[PDB]
Design a protein around this ligand. Structure first.
Ligand SMILES: Nc1ncnc2c1ncn2[C@@H]1O[C@H](C[C@@H](N)CC[C@H](N)C(=O)O)[C@@H](O)[C@H]1O
Length: 281
């Protein structure tokens, strides 16, 4: 049943950029291409982490390996990536092995749950939606515990608003948004759950982290989703051929719907920074 909403890598290749990044890009400056903006998003995350040569960076949910490789290349760090996909695992291995570096590089097919080795810094870009609210305490506790005194982590995640906050916008739109969120979390990220930004901040605080004001990426996700959607739609027949009209329609619903709900400010995307007590200034 969870395996039903699994789709082949070749479908995603029909809307994503060459880096295969499956998360909000960063159009700064606005004229960047999707691919460029995916790299700008990687940098935006990594630049907040106080990475020094010879550190070990952990990528939780490392996808196809772009973040890790960019970190090795820019920061001359060791890396370790965690992924739940065997295909991502095999590709990441290739991406990592081909880097001209003496730094250590490792990809593991496992969750953060089973990861407990010392790392200096943590990046997690839109894996958090999969974890479920019941695991937030354990996630933050693990991330706090594996890092040294000056550790830092970024988590980037799509977020929703509490039903109470949504109600301020009127019942109609509020119930309609909740249904669409339920759809995201059934058919796009099965077993998933969108946090609110408050939940992201507060669980981090409870674990002991200092949490500055989160960065909103809402207009960047709008641009991202627009390009993703326009691109899927243009590759429609190729999409249907490799999957079905069903699966095509599902992702168009997702992509258009999210853009719509982002434009309406009924969804957000937060880049939250977590600083251990001894983190540098
Ligand atoms: N418990 C977990 N531990 C580690 N990775 C996970 C977990 N749950 C989901 N993921 C991964 O999180 C990733 C989710 C993607 N949305 C983001 C991938 C990547 N960071 C990107 O920006 O492209 C996929 O690699 C999933 O396998």
């Amino acid at each position: 049943i969870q395996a039903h909403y699994d789709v082949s890598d070749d479908f995603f290749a029909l809307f994503q950029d060459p880096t295969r990044t499956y998360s909000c890009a960063y159009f700064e400056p606005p004229e960047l291409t999707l691919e460029e903006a995916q790299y700008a998003k990687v940098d935006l995350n990594l630049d907040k982490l106080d990475l020094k040569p010879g550190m070990t960076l952990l990528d939780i949910g490392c996808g196809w390996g772009t973040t890790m490789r960019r970190a090795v290349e820019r920061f001359d760090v060791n890396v370790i990536g965690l992924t739940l996909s065997k295909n991502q695992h095999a590709r990441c291995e290739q991406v990592l092995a081909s880097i001209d570096t003496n730094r250590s590089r490792q990809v593991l097919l496992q969750g953060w749950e089973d990861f407990a080795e010392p790392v200096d810094r943590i990046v997690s870009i839109e894996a958090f939606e999969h974890f479920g609210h019941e695991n937030y305490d354990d996630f933050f506790k693990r991330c706090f515990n594996i890092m040294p005194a000056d550790g830092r982590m970024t988590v980037q995640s799509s977020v929703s608003y509490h039903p109470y906050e949504m109600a301020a916008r009127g019942k109609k739109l509020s119930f309609e948004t909740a249904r669409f969120i339920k759809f995201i979390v059934t058919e796009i990220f099965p077993g998933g759950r969108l946090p609110s930004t408050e939940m992201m901040v507060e669980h981090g605080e409870k674990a002991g982290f200092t949490v500055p004001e989160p960065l909103s990426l809402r207009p960047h996700y709008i641009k991202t989703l627009r390009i993703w959607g326009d691109t899927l739609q243009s590759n429609k027949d190729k999409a249907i051929e490799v999957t079905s009209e069903e699966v095509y329609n599902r992702y168009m619903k997702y992509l258009r719907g999210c853009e719509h709900y982002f434009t309406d400010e009924m969804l957000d995307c937060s880049l939250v920074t977590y600083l251990k007590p001894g983190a540098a200034a």
